Design a protein around this ligand. Structure first.
Ligand code: HEM
Ligand code: HEM
Lengths: 145, 145
Protein backbone atom coordinates (compact mmCIF):
# COMPACT_ATOMS: atom_id res chain seq x y z
CA UNK A 1 0.00 0.00 0.00
CA UNK A 2 1.08 3.61 -0.54
CA UNK A 3 1.20 4.24 3.23
CA UNK A 4 3.46 1.21 3.84
CA UNK A 5 5.70 2.20 0.88
CA UNK A 6 6.00 5.80 2.17
CA UNK A 7 7.20 4.24 5.48
CA UNK A 8 10.24 2.76 3.69
CA UNK A 9 11.67 6.27 3.19
CA UNK A 10 14.05 6.16 6.17
CA UNK A 11 16.25 9.01 7.40
CA UNK A 12 19.24 8.16 5.25
CA UNK A 13 17.10 7.43 2.18
CA UNK A 14 15.56 10.92 2.56
CA UNK A 15 19.02 12.47 2.91
CA UNK A 16 20.45 10.68 -0.14
CA UNK A 17 17.37 11.82 -2.19
CA UNK A 18 17.89 15.42 -1.06
CA UNK A 19 21.67 15.46 -1.68
CA UNK A 20 21.37 13.97 -5.18
CA UNK A 21 18.34 16.12 -6.12
CA UNK A 22 20.41 19.22 -5.19
CA UNK A 23 22.52 18.37 -8.21
CA UNK A 24 20.04 16.67 -10.56
CA UNK A 25 17.24 19.20 -10.00
CA UNK A 26 19.69 22.01 -10.84
CA UNK A 27 19.16 21.56 -14.54
CA UNK A 28 15.60 20.44 -15.01
CA UNK A 29 15.62 20.83 -18.76
CA UNK A 30 18.87 18.98 -19.42
CA UNK A 31 18.41 16.16 -16.94
CA UNK A 32 14.67 15.91 -17.68
CA UNK A 33 15.42 15.47 -21.40
CA UNK A 34 18.27 13.07 -20.62
CA UNK A 35 15.88 10.88 -18.57
CA UNK A 36 13.24 10.64 -21.34
CA UNK A 37 15.76 9.99 -24.11
CA UNK A 38 17.34 7.23 -21.97
CA UNK A 39 13.91 5.66 -21.33
CA UNK A 40 13.14 5.72 -25.08
CA UNK A 41 16.57 4.24 -25.90
CA UNK A 42 16.52 1.51 -23.26
CA UNK A 43 12.78 0.74 -23.48
CA UNK A 44 11.63 1.44 -27.01
CA UNK A 45 8.40 -0.37 -26.20
CA UNK A 46 7.40 2.68 -24.09
CA UNK A 47 7.39 5.06 -27.06
CA UNK A 48 3.85 4.03 -27.97
CA UNK A 49 2.50 5.76 -24.83
CA UNK A 50 4.02 9.03 -26.07
CA UNK A 51 2.50 9.24 -29.52
CA UNK A 52 1.34 12.81 -28.82
CA UNK A 53 5.01 13.96 -28.54
CA UNK A 54 5.82 13.28 -32.18
CA UNK A 55 9.38 12.28 -33.12
CA UNK A 56 11.04 11.70 -29.77
CA UNK A 57 14.43 11.06 -31.47
CA UNK A 58 14.69 14.81 -32.05
CA UNK A 59 15.40 15.16 -28.30
CA UNK A 60 15.81 18.78 -27.16
CA UNK A 61 14.62 20.10 -30.54
CA UNK A 62 11.15 18.54 -30.11
CA UNK A 63 9.19 21.27 -28.35
CA UNK A 64 6.56 18.81 -27.03
CA UNK A 65 9.21 16.46 -25.63
CA UNK A 66 10.99 19.43 -24.07
CA UNK A 67 7.80 20.72 -22.44
CA UNK A 68 7.00 17.21 -21.09
CA UNK A 69 10.57 16.63 -19.75
CA UNK A 70 10.72 19.95 -17.94
CA UNK A 71 7.32 19.30 -16.39
CA UNK A 72 8.26 15.78 -15.25
CA UNK A 73 11.11 17.34 -13.18
CA UNK A 74 8.57 19.51 -11.26
CA UNK A 75 6.68 16.36 -10.15
CA UNK A 76 10.02 15.06 -8.75
CA UNK A 77 10.61 18.44 -7.07
CA UNK A 78 7.16 18.15 -5.55
CA UNK A 79 7.94 14.65 -4.12
CA UNK A 80 11.30 15.86 -2.62
CA UNK A 81 9.57 18.85 -1.03
CA UNK A 82 6.99 16.53 0.66
CA UNK A 83 9.60 14.22 2.23
CA UNK A 84 9.21 15.83 5.71
CA UNK A 85 5.52 15.01 5.87
CA UNK A 86 4.41 11.47 4.90
CA UNK A 87 0.75 12.54 4.85
CA UNK A 88 1.50 15.25 2.28
CA UNK A 89 3.78 12.95 0.28
CA UNK A 90 1.08 10.32 0.06
CA UNK A 91 -1.69 12.72 -1.06
CA UNK A 92 0.65 14.21 -3.73
CA UNK A 93 1.63 10.69 -4.96
CA UNK A 94 -2.00 9.57 -5.21
CA UNK A 95 -2.85 12.81 -7.06
CA UNK A 96 0.07 12.16 -9.49
CA UNK A 97 -1.10 8.57 -10.00
CA UNK A 98 -4.60 9.52 -11.32
CA UNK A 99 -3.47 10.42 -14.86
CA UNK A 100 -1.01 7.50 -15.01
CA UNK A 101 -3.75 5.06 -14.01
CA UNK A 102 -5.99 6.59 -16.69
CA UNK A 103 -3.26 5.92 -19.25
CA UNK A 104 -2.95 2.31 -18.12
CA UNK A 105 0.60 2.66 -16.90
CA UNK A 106 1.06 -0.28 -14.52
CA UNK A 107 3.52 -0.45 -11.61
CA UNK A 108 5.87 -2.65 -13.77
CA UNK A 109 5.74 -0.20 -16.66
CA UNK A 110 6.42 2.79 -14.37
CA UNK A 111 9.37 0.93 -12.76
CA UNK A 112 11.14 1.11 -16.14
CA UNK A 113 12.18 4.69 -15.17
CA UNK A 114 14.63 3.23 -12.63
CA UNK A 115 17.26 2.39 -15.35
CA UNK A 116 17.14 5.93 -16.76
CA UNK A 117 17.38 7.40 -13.25
CA UNK A 118 20.35 5.26 -12.38
CA UNK A 119 22.11 6.28 -15.59
CA UNK A 120 21.47 10.02 -15.10
CA UNK A 121 22.71 9.77 -11.50
CA UNK A 122 25.85 7.86 -12.55
CA UNK A 123 26.51 10.64 -15.06
CA UNK A 124 26.70 13.09 -12.09
CA UNK A 125 28.92 10.88 -9.99
CA UNK A 126 26.07 9.43 -7.89
CA UNK A 127 26.44 5.66 -7.57
CA UNK A 128 24.34 2.68 -6.52
CA UNK A 129 23.49 4.00 -3.08
CA UNK A 130 21.68 6.91 -4.75
CA UNK A 131 20.05 4.79 -7.45
CA UNK A 132 18.64 2.58 -4.68
CA UNK A 133 17.30 5.61 -2.69
CA UNK A 134 15.50 6.78 -5.84
CA UNK A 135 14.15 3.27 -6.52
CA UNK A 136 12.52 3.54 -3.05
CA UNK A 137 10.82 6.80 -3.94
CA UNK A 138 9.67 5.31 -7.28
CA UNK A 139 8.28 2.34 -5.28
CA UNK A 140 5.92 4.77 -3.46
CA UNK A 141 4.43 5.75 -6.83
CA UNK A 142 4.29 2.13 -7.94
CA UNK A 143 2.27 1.27 -4.81
CA UNK A 144 -0.37 3.78 -6.01
CA UNK A 145 -0.66 2.36 -9.52
CA UNK B 1 -0.73 32.52 -30.36
CA UNK B 2 0.93 31.66 -27.01
CA UNK B 3 4.08 33.47 -28.17
CA UNK B 4 2.03 36.65 -28.63
CA UNK B 5 0.52 36.46 -25.18
CA UNK B 6 3.97 35.70 -23.77
CA UNK B 7 5.05 39.01 -25.39
CA UNK B 8 3.01 40.88 -22.76
CA UNK B 9 5.30 39.58 -20.03
CA UNK B 10 7.55 42.68 -20.03
CA UNK B 11 10.54 43.01 -17.77
CA UNK B 12 8.42 44.87 -15.16
CA UNK B 13 5.71 42.23 -15.26
CA UNK B 14 8.34 39.44 -14.85
CA UNK B 15 9.88 41.21 -11.87
CA UNK B 16 6.52 41.62 -10.13
CA UNK B 17 5.72 37.95 -10.73
CA UNK B 18 9.12 36.79 -9.32
CA UNK B 19 8.91 39.05 -6.21
CA UNK B 20 5.37 38.03 -5.33
CA UNK B 21 6.13 34.33 -6.04
CA UNK B 22 9.03 34.59 -3.61
CA UNK B 23 6.33 34.97 -0.91
CA UNK B 24 3.38 33.05 -2.31
CA UNK B 25 5.42 30.04 -3.40
CA UNK B 26 7.06 29.78 0.09
CA UNK B 27 3.92 28.01 1.50
CA UNK B 28 2.66 25.89 -1.39
CA UNK B 29 0.20 23.92 0.73
CA UNK B 30 -1.29 26.93 2.60
CA UNK B 31 -1.51 29.19 -0.45
CA UNK B 32 -2.53 26.42 -2.87
CA UNK B 33 -5.44 25.45 -0.57
CA UNK B 34 -6.42 29.12 -0.02
CA UNK B 35 -6.51 29.50 -3.86
CA UNK B 36 -8.76 26.48 -4.34
CA UNK B 37 -11.14 27.27 -1.48
CA UNK B 38 -11.45 30.86 -2.67
CA UNK B 39 -12.29 29.65 -6.18
CA UNK B 40 -14.98 27.33 -4.83
CA UNK B 41 -16.39 30.12 -2.61
CA UNK B 42 -16.53 32.78 -5.28
CA UNK B 43 -17.48 30.56 -8.24
CA UNK B 44 -19.41 27.65 -6.81
CA UNK B 45 -20.13 26.31 -10.35
CA UNK B 46 -16.43 25.41 -10.69
CA UNK B 47 -16.94 22.53 -8.19
CA UNK B 48 -18.59 20.78 -11.13
CA UNK B 49 -15.16 19.85 -12.53
CA UNK B 50 -13.87 18.53 -9.19
CA UNK B 51 -16.23 15.69 -8.33
CA UNK B 52 -13.18 13.39 -7.96
CA UNK B 53 -12.00 15.47 -4.95
CA UNK B 54 -15.10 14.60 -2.90
CA UNK B 55 -16.03 16.82 0.03
CA UNK B 56 -14.26 20.04 -0.94
CA UNK B 57 -15.94 21.71 2.02
CA UNK B 58 -13.33 19.98 4.23
CA UNK B 59 -10.62 22.24 2.79
CA UNK B 60 -7.08 21.45 3.90
CA UNK B 61 -8.28 18.33 5.79
CA UNK B 62 -9.45 16.71 2.57
CA UNK B 63 -6.40 14.74 1.39
CA UNK B 64 -7.40 14.78 -2.29
CA UNK B 65 -8.04 18.55 -2.26
CA UNK B 66 -4.76 19.07 -0.37
CA UNK B 67 -2.94 16.82 -2.92
CA UNK B 68 -4.39 18.74 -5.88
CA UNK B 69 -3.68 22.17 -4.22
CA UNK B 70 0.01 21.45 -3.55
CA UNK B 71 0.43 20.12 -7.12
CA UNK B 72 -1.22 23.18 -8.67
CA UNK B 73 1.57 25.31 -7.05
CA UNK B 74 4.28 23.30 -8.91
CA UNK B 75 2.70 24.29 -12.24
CA UNK B 76 3.07 27.96 -11.20
CA UNK B 77 6.65 27.26 -9.95
CA UNK B 78 7.44 25.79 -13.40
CA UNK B 79 5.98 28.84 -15.18
CA UNK B 80 7.88 31.33 -12.97
CA UNK B 81 11.12 29.41 -13.53
CA UNK B 82 10.73 29.72 -17.34
CA UNK B 83 10.04 33.47 -17.52
CA UNK B 84 13.40 34.38 -19.11
CA UNK B 85 13.14 31.91 -21.95
CA UNK B 86 9.98 32.42 -24.02
CA UNK B 87 10.63 29.23 -25.98
CA UNK B 88 10.61 27.11 -22.78
CA UNK B 89 7.71 29.05 -21.28
CA UNK B 90 5.61 28.39 -24.33
CA UNK B 91 6.40 24.66 -24.46
CA UNK B 92 5.59 24.21 -20.72
CA UNK B 93 2.32 26.22 -21.13
CA UNK B 94 1.19 24.15 -24.13
CA UNK B 95 2.11 20.92 -22.22
CA UNK B 96 0.06 22.18 -19.24
CA UNK B 97 -2.97 23.01 -21.42
CA UNK B 98 -3.33 19.50 -22.93
CA UNK B 99 -5.22 18.04 -19.92
CA UNK B 100 -7.17 21.21 -19.40
CA UNK B 101 -8.42 21.15 -23.02
CA UNK B 102 -9.34 17.49 -22.58
CA UNK B 103 -11.47 18.48 -19.59
CA UNK B 104 -13.15 21.09 -21.75
CA UNK B 105 -12.06 24.04 -19.63
CA UNK B 106 -12.35 27.13 -21.85
CA UNK B 107 -10.22 30.26 -21.56
CA UNK B 108 -13.19 32.04 -20.01
CA UNK B 109 -13.62 29.35 -17.39
CA UNK B 110 -9.86 29.25 -16.67
CA UNK B 111 -9.96 33.02 -16.12
CA UNK B 112 -12.14 32.54 -13.04
CA UNK B 113 -8.81 31.84 -11.20
CA UNK B 114 -7.91 35.58 -11.44
CA UNK B 115 -10.17 36.68 -8.53
CA UNK B 116 -8.80 34.00 -6.17
CA UNK B 117 -5.25 34.96 -7.20
CA UNK B 118 -5.94 38.62 -6.46
CA UNK B 119 -7.38 37.78 -3.00
CA UNK B 120 -4.45 35.50 -2.11
CA UNK B 121 -1.95 38.22 -3.18
CA UNK B 122 -3.87 40.82 -1.16
CA UNK B 123 -3.82 38.56 1.93
CA UNK B 124 0.02 38.84 1.70
CA UNK B 125 -0.18 42.59 1.04
CA UNK B 126 0.50 42.42 -2.74
CA UNK B 127 -1.67 45.11 -4.31
CA UNK B 128 -3.32 45.64 -7.69
CA UNK B 129 0.08 46.08 -9.38
CA UNK B 130 0.77 42.43 -8.59
CA UNK B 131 -2.69 41.08 -9.46
CA UNK B 132 -2.37 42.69 -12.94
CA UNK B 133 0.97 40.98 -13.44
CA UNK B 134 -0.56 37.62 -12.54
CA UNK B 135 -3.52 38.25 -14.81
CA UNK B 136 -0.98 38.61 -17.71
CA UNK B 137 0.58 35.20 -16.87
CA UNK B 138 -2.89 33.56 -16.72
CA UNK B 139 -3.59 35.14 -20.17
CA UNK B 140 -0.65 33.16 -21.67
CA UNK B 141 -2.34 29.99 -20.48
CA UNK B 142 -5.70 31.29 -21.75
CA UNK B 143 -4.10 31.75 -25.18
CA UNK B 144 -3.36 27.98 -25.23
CA UNK B 145 -6.90 26.89 -24.28
C1 HEM C 1 9.94 9.52 -12.72
C2 HEM C 1 8.83 9.06 -13.24
C3 HEM C 1 7.77 9.94 -13.90
C4 HEM C 1 7.40 11.18 -13.58
C5 HEM C 1 7.89 12.11 -12.44
C6 HEM C 1 6.33 11.55 -14.50
C7 HEM C 1 5.69 12.77 -14.50
C8 HEM C 1 4.70 13.21 -15.38
C9 HEM C 1 4.00 14.49 -15.35
C10 HEM C 1 4.20 15.61 -14.33
C11 HEM C 1 3.11 14.46 -16.38
C12 HEM C 1 2.13 15.57 -16.77
C13 HEM C 1 0.77 15.51 -16.00
C14 HEM C 1 -0.02 14.26 -16.33
O1 HEM C 1 -0.59 14.33 -17.46
O2 HEM C 1 -0.10 13.28 -15.56
C15 HEM C 1 3.25 13.17 -17.02
C16 HEM C 1 2.61 12.76 -18.17
C17 HEM C 1 2.72 11.54 -18.86
N1 HEM C 1 3.35 10.45 -18.31
FE1 HEM C 1 4.47 10.38 -16.61
N2 HEM C 1 6.11 10.52 -15.40
C18 HEM C 1 6.98 9.54 -15.05
C19 HEM C 1 7.08 8.29 -15.66
C20 HEM C 1 6.30 7.89 -16.72
C21 HEM C 1 6.42 6.58 -17.38
C22 HEM C 1 7.51 5.55 -17.02
C23 HEM C 1 5.50 6.55 -18.31
C24 HEM C 1 5.16 5.54 -19.41
C25 HEM C 1 5.78 4.38 -19.56
C26 HEM C 1 4.75 7.81 -18.26
C27 HEM C 1 3.72 8.16 -19.12
C28 HEM C 1 3.22 9.45 -19.26
C29 HEM C 1 2.51 9.95 -20.43
C30 HEM C 1 2.24 9.08 -21.70
C31 HEM C 1 2.20 11.21 -20.17
C32 HEM C 1 1.51 12.20 -21.11
C33 HEM C 1 2.55 12.74 -22.15
C34 HEM C 1 1.94 13.83 -23.02
O3 HEM C 1 1.12 13.40 -23.85
O4 HEM C 1 2.25 15.02 -22.85
N3 HEM C 1 5.24 8.62 -17.22
N4 HEM C 1 4.22 12.40 -16.38
C1 HEM D 1 -3.57 29.04 -12.04
C2 HEM D 1 -4.43 28.12 -12.44
C3 HEM D 1 -4.27 26.59 -12.46
C4 HEM D 1 -3.19 25.84 -12.29
C5 HEM D 1 -1.73 26.31 -12.05
C6 HEM D 1 -3.64 24.44 -12.39
C7 HEM D 1 -2.79 23.35 -12.32
C8 HEM D 1 -3.21 22.03 -12.39
C9 HEM D 1 -2.32 20.91 -12.35
C10 HEM D 1 -0.79 21.05 -12.22
C11 HEM D 1 -3.08 19.80 -12.41
C12 HEM D 1 -2.56 18.35 -12.42
C13 HEM D 1 -2.11 17.84 -13.79
C14 HEM D 1 -3.28 17.71 -14.73
O1 HEM D 1 -4.07 16.75 -14.55
O2 HEM D 1 -3.50 18.56 -15.61
C15 HEM D 1 -4.45 20.25 -12.55
C16 HEM D 1 -5.58 19.42 -12.59
C17 HEM D 1 -6.90 19.85 -12.78
N1 HEM D 1 -7.27 21.12 -13.08
FE1 HEM D 1 -6.08 22.76 -13.26
N2 HEM D 1 -5.01 24.40 -12.65
C18 HEM D 1 -5.40 25.69 -12.69
C19 HEM D 1 -6.73 26.11 -12.90
C20 HEM D 1 -7.82 25.26 -13.10
C21 HEM D 1 -9.20 25.76 -13.28
C22 HEM D 1 -9.59 27.22 -13.18
C23 HEM D 1 -9.97 24.63 -13.42
C24 HEM D 1 -11.48 24.48 -13.63
C25 HEM D 1 -12.37 25.43 -13.45
C26 HEM D 1 -9.08 23.48 -13.40
C27 HEM D 1 -9.48 22.16 -13.49
C28 HEM D 1 -8.67 21.10 -13.21
C29 HEM D 1 -9.16 19.76 -12.86
C30 HEM D 1 -10.67 19.37 -12.81
C31 HEM D 1 -8.09 19.00 -12.65
C32 HEM D 1 -8.03 17.52 -12.19
C33 HEM D 1 -8.42 17.47 -10.70
C34 HEM D 1 -8.36 16.09 -10.10
O3 HEM D 1 -9.34 15.32 -10.29
O4 HEM D 1 -7.36 15.74 -9.43
N3 HEM D 1 -7.76 23.90 -13.25
N4 HEM D 1 -4.50 21.62 -12.57
Amino acid sequence: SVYDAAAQLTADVKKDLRDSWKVIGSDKKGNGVALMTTLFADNQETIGYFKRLGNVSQGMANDKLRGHSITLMYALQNFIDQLDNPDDLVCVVEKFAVNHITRKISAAEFGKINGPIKKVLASKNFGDKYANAWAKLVAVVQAAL
